């Protein structure tokens, strides 16, 4: 079988926190504050091996190049909203929209980041949970029938990395948008992969598995996974059992939420 590393690792420093107490104190948003995060990713640069989500107090403007992650914060107002929030419920739907998004727009929307949080600027504790939604069809599996490794400075790896987006396709030999029609009768799909582990693409990569196989079913999906890191691989997979109705939604980081209580000096 193929595995997949969590997608990221959150990385909140505290001028998360403070920014987002900043913004949820610029207007007294008593209800739950549903706020875009910006983080520009450091494809270079890894945390423990899986994409490093940093949110600083930056994460929260959209910036000008590099590669700009595009995530969605969900503060709650209240400690029990947030440990009431059915997780599952959130993630499965958050699940559902990039699903959409991917067969029919690009493959590139089927990836972001949603974290929920509680920030108690009372008690000064700040609870949060990110989540990075990665869905696959209910009690599907995926075995990688191919793998290769990828150099990294191929004129079309470059071409690849030339590219602001962490998703693409290859269609006669030149990257293309992954797209639709593309992703019908590209040979495959090119990944910005956010983990670094050896072979072990991103809990995210079913995201695109999911959506490129209901838009152009096939015996086999064959994925380039580019990693600054020299781990960069191509592989082929085959989906098992992916046609049940359901979607199996994860990514929610480990599972229980993270609670800094910046008020200990």
């Known amino acids: 079988d193929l595995k997949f590393a969590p997608s990221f690792q959150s990385f909140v420093d505290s001028s998360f926190f403070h920014e987002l107490s900043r913004l949820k104190l610029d207007i007294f948003k008593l ?13 270079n640069q890894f945390t423990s091996n899986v994409l490093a989500i940093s ?22 107002n209240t400690i029990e909203l947030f440990k009431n929030c059915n997780k599952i419920q959130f993630i499965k739907e958050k699940g559902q929209e990039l699903l959409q998004r991917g067969l029919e727009n690009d493959l590139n929307e089927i990836i972001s980041f949603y974290m929920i949080s509680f ?24 075995q990688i ?45 090119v990944f910005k992969d956010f983990s670094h582990l050896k072979d072990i693409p991103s809990a995210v990569t079913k ?36 046609n049940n109705p359901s979607l199996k939604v994860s990514g929610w980081e480990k599972l229980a939420p993270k609670s800094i209580d910046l008020s200990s000096l």
């Open 207 to 242: 995201n695109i598995l999911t959506v490129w196989s209901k838009l152009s079913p096939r015996e086999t999906y064959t994925i380039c996974f580019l990693r600054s890191d020299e781990s960069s691989f191509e592989a082929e997979i085959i989906i098992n059992n992916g």
């Open 119 to 142: 920030a108690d600027l009372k008690k000064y504790k700040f609870y949060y949970w990110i989540c990075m939604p990665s869905f696959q069809s209910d009690g599907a599996t995926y």
């Open 31 to 43: 209800d739950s504050d549903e706020k875009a995060l910006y983080t520009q990713l450091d494809l």
């Open 145 to 189: 029938i191919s793998s290769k490794v990828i150099a990294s400075d191929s004129d079309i790896s470059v071409s690849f990395i030339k590219q602001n987006v962490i998703i693409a396709c290859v269609i006669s030999g030149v990257i293309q948008k992954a797209t639709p029609d593309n992703l019908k009768v590209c040979e495959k799909v």
């Open 55 to 76: 949110l600083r107090d930056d994460s929260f403007q959209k910036p000008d190049h590099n590669i700009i992650l595009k995530g969605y914060l969900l503060n709650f």
